[PDB]
Amino acid sequence: IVDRAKMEDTLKRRFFYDQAFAIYGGVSGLYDFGPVGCALKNNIIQTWRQHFIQEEQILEIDCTMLTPEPVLKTSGHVDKFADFMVKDVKNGECFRADHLLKAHLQKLMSDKKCSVEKKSEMESVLAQLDNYGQQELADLFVNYNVKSPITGNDLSPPVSFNLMFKTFIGPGGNMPGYLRPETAQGIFLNFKRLLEFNQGKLPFAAAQIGNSFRNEISPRSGLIRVREFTMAEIEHFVDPSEKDHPKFQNVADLHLYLYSAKAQVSGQSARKMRLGDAVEQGVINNTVLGYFIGRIYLYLTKVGISPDKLRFRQHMENEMYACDCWDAESKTSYGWIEIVGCADRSCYDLSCHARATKVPLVAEKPYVEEVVPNVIEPSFGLGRIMYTVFEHTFHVREGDEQRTFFSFPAVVAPFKCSVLPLSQNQEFMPFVKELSEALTRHGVSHKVDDSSGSIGRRYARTDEIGVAFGVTIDFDTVNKTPHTATLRDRDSMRQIRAEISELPSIVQDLANGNITWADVEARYPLFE
Amino acid sequence: IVDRAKMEDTLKRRFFYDQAFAIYGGVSGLYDFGPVGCALKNNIIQTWRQHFIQEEQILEIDCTMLTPEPVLKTSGHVDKFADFMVKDVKNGECFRADHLLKAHLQKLMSDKKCSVEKKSEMESVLAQLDNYGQQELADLFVNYNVKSPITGNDLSPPVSFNLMFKTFIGPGGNMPGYLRPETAQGIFLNFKRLLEFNQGKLPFAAAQIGNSFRNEISPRSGLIRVREFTMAEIEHFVDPSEKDHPKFQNVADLHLYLYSAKAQVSGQSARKMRLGDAVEQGVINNTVLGYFIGRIYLYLTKVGISPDKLRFRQHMENEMYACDCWDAESKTSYGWIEIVGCADRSCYDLSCHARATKVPLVAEKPYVEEVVPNVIEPSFGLGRIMYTVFEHTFHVREGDEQRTFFSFPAVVAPFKCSVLPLSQNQEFMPFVKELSEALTRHGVSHKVDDSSGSIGRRYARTDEIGVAFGVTIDFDTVNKTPHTATLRDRDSMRQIRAEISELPSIVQDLANGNITWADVEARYPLFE
Numbered sequence A, B: 001i002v003d004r005a006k007m008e009d010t011l012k013r014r015f016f017y018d019q020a021f022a023i024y025g026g027v028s029g030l031y032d033f034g035p036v037g038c039a040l041k042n043n044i045i046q047t048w049r050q051h052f053i054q055e056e057q058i059l060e061i062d063c064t065m066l067t068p069e070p071v072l073k074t075s076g077h078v079d080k081f082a083d084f085m086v087k088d089v090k091n092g093e094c095f096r097a098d099h100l101l102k103a104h105l106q107k108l109m110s111d112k113k114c115s116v117e118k119k120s121e122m123e124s125v126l127a128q129l130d131n132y133g134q135q136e137l138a139d140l141f142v143n144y145n146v147k148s149p150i151t152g153n154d155l156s157p158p159v160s161f162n163l164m165f166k167t168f169i170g171p172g173g174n175m176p177g178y179l180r181p182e183t184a185q186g187i188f189l190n191f192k193r194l195l196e197f198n199q200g201k202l203p204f205a206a207a208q209i210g211n212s213f214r215n216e217i218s219p220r221s222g223l224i225r226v227r228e229f230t231m232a233e234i235e236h237f238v239d240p241s242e243k244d245h246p247k248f249q250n251v252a253d254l255h256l257y258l259y260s261a262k263a264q265v266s267g268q269s270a271r272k273m274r275l276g277d278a279v280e281q282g283v284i285n286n287t288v289l290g291y292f293i294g295r296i297y298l299y300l301t302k303v304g305i306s307p308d309k310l311r312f313r314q315h316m317e318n319e320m321y322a323c324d325c326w327d328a329e330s331k332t333s334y335g336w337i338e339i340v341g342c343a344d345r346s347c348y349d350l351s352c353h354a355r356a357t358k359v360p361l362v363a364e365k366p367y368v369e370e371v372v373p374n375v376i377e378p379s380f381g382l383g384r385i386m387y388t389v390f391e392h393t394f395h396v397r398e399g400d401e402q403r404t405f406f407s408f409p410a411v412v413a414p415f416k417c418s419v420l421p422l423s424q425n426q427e428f429m430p431f432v433k434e435l436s437e438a439l440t441r442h443g444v445s446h447k448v449d450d451s452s453g454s455i456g457r458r459y460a461r462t463d464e465i466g467v468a469f470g471v472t473i474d475f476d477t478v479n480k481t482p483h484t485a486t487l488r489d490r491d492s493m494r495q496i497r498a499e500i501s502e503l504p505s506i507v508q509d510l511a512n513g514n515i516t517w518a519d520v521e522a523r524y525p526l527f528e
Helices: A004-013 A035-056 A069-074 A097-107 A116-127 A134-143 A184-189 A191-197 A261-266 A275-280 A287-302 A349-357 A382-393 A429-441 A455-464 A475-479 A503-511 A517-523 B004-013 B035-056 B069-074 B097-107 B116-127 B134-143 B184-189 B191-197 B261-266 B275-280 B287-302 B349-357 B382-393 B429-441 B455-464 B475-479 B503-511 B517-523
Strands: A017-019 A031-033 A066-068 A082-087 A094-096 A159-162 A166-169 A175-179 A204-213 A228-238 A255-259 A271-274 A310-314 A324-332 A335-345 A374-381 A394-396 A404-406 A417-421 A446-448 A469-473 A484-489 A495-499 B017-019 B031-033 B066-068 B082-087 B094-096 B159-162 B166-169 B175-179 B204-213 B228-238 B255-259 B271-274 B310-314 B324-332 B335-345 B374-381 B394-396 B404-406 B417-421 B446-448 B469-473 B484-489 B495-499
Touching (some): A004 A017, A004 A382, A004 A404, A031 A035, A035 A204, A035 A228, A035 A382, A069 A184, A082 A097, A097 A116, A097 A134, A184 A349, A228 A287, A261 A310, A271 A275, A287 A335, A287 A374, A310 A335, A374 A382, A404 A455, A417 A429, A469 A503, A475 A484, A484 A503, B004 B394, B004 B404, B031 B035, B035 B382, B066 B069, B066 B166, B069 B175, B097 B116, B184 B191, B184 B228, B184 B349, B191 B204, B228 B287, B228 B382, B255 B275, B261 B310, B271 B275, B287 B374, B335 B382, B404 B455, B417 B429, B417 B455, B429 B503, B455 B469, B475 B484, B495 B503
Parallel strands (some): A417 A469
Antiparallel strands (some): A066 A175, A082 A159, A255 A271, A310 A324, A484 A495, B066 B175, B082 B094, B166 B175, B204 B228, B255 B271, B324 B335, B335 B374, B394 B404, B469 B484, B484 B495
């Protein structure tokens, strides 16, 4: 039930992120990230790197965004990566068909003057809304006499509109291409090089962190629906016969909300289960998919998402070569939204490219068994993760002045700690320098505060952008011996007093989760 | 005089980088980077981050690549970011005019049957080759009867060909746009937000690390001329009246090769000068520009470029609102090539956008002085830096088998150290685990070697991809007490023997440059 306006205000005011090309009028679905936002984004990515690449020793590659047409023809995208779009005949404006239609069948759905059996009829229409083909959808438009929501004019018949941005590579019009809609295809195109790099053996996993593009018809859902965005995508190639993950028991004990395709057809609600139990009972298929679902859950928790607003939903038969497919979804002000994809495929694009180019993309096994690997496809939409974190960590303090703060875990906070020196009086400098150097020597990110206003108001700002900790340096620090300073916990706003030499060590342990605030108060004298 | 073929082979064989879309035929000017290359690229970027962003507390932003037309009209790019292109009339192929012409006037230039005064004439033509406008160039084509180098057919008149990739944002053809040719414009568009973020004060510097695109007519210079590429660009906004950099004396003592616009017109060679002296004598204008030139020099050295193949060349009057402008150029197998731009501007795009959009982009000063800041524009072409490093660190060992290696400084090496366990015998594991954990605890990147073949051949591979150090674990390590292992220096191939507990500390200091190999041998027993 978060106050999205209040948050969005804070987010824009402090320049986490904002409308790209604002002064030229802005462009919808495009955002610039300000220094604070970049800090956070960079943390989220580093956290991801240690959590996945480093931990599973993944093979990282970095392919181009520019993509010639034939490759994306082969992947189907040229043909099938599109949305149905009607447009206003008298005006000219464009609308996304399915949710414009859905809008109409919620006015009619919600009307006392409408019959019960008719609600039932439209309820079922929405039920299989994503199924209807071109023609069926065009009939649905006539049958419910759909009009433009802005003007109310007659609506053209729904055409398909491909979502890839089109250019030409080179001069003339010889080589047309697109901006990649996903990084998965780059990994596929390098399957051979990667497989070889892995000494020919299997399993192995490749990764990419980069931008893909998606020419959305009319984005108006803030940062959730954007035209350009950064992904972190993993492609874990496994032998179908050796499909048990050795590290699974590391995450087998995790309890988490799962929402099966069978639970959805029944009209049952989601279930919190122990990962092990789920895979043992057949809900989750195998422990490779299982392993990654657990890791994804662990990662998202780490980065600030609330476990009680996090679930894994399985694709149903209709929504698809099909696949066992789970999505991490977070409960938000925009509803439950998908923020990490996780597919399990037998037949997929690797096979297509192979016979397309006449270059074999397979693995040998000593007989010489040609193996077409399965893939698990963890797909991270960094933007949406980041937003989910904003909504989940945003809080308003009880202070009548309506102060806000983000409860960011230290591992993602724009920086872990703020040094507040009461004065710039050059007799403060040695203490600040040393503290800063110490914090650096301990790998604890920090920024020395040079803002005007009271000690209290200065922290307010710190808190507004979610800095985990603070260390005030006052005259007693500089003058009394031993030299001690105040450590302030963001969340509680509580404080402690310890020797300034000791603090770097203390803060490190707090941010690294070796020690609780509770622990600290137990060990060090309380300060107000 | 590096052997480019031998290097290129090694580079492709180990998948530092390779032809994008190879199996689809490849596309010119586009490259995928394999795991090793990504490691290196990521290091180069991190090194840059500490060296610039972190050190100067720069404001990092991250704007979009997709750019609507009007902004790039305003920056001139729509009009003036283009190359002259003739094409073969009977065939149809495209060629970059200036260097195709230049090619003709080097055959004619180098001919005994040609007169001395004629060489003189064409020498001068090449002299102001970049100047000639559309028509003049078209006359130059007739006058020297230029033909297609492939076929030899008559050549069309040189048209201008804009180098920006064109798309449309959204549906229909309402909002045409381009892929950004540089990240500088994003910073400009956010000038207000950034200036405010800096408490209204000045100076301040913004940065961006991202990709820009450049639709090259016919790239055939390997990684030097590419269509898509990553930049790190800084925009340092300074008050013209307060244009002295406080930290300049940090780099004032640096000696480095400078090559003035006046030295170039004279036909003099470059000069090695002390930075201070250069700015004191007027060669370099001010210590803000000076400071950054020094930092750039320091950075490039750090990342592996040879000081004796590094120079700073000043733009001449003709090549341009003009600007005092220096480029870092590295001497390579492709000749001296520019790898870091560094402009100093008074009048530039910020002013244009301001009056374009009717949004003031200026700084106040308390009277209320409207200040239009100057900018220093350090522009890093990461790709070319990386390549220059490949050429500068590549070496062939005296070993008759023709073994190569890269002498990469540890700070950029794909990883700093290789753990070589003689066996996978599970009695080796505790030692390897502990060593690995230790190295991790010391922030020393490393990879435990699981390759077949002799201890010597295993290091050969390590060396081939430029891993700085190695630690062999043998039976004497596992069985004899105290437990010691062999430390092997990549460059010298020399070795030492020290207690395995001590090594993490030792290696850290070696990679961090606290200690020499020399130092190590002085302190620890030598091993063969």
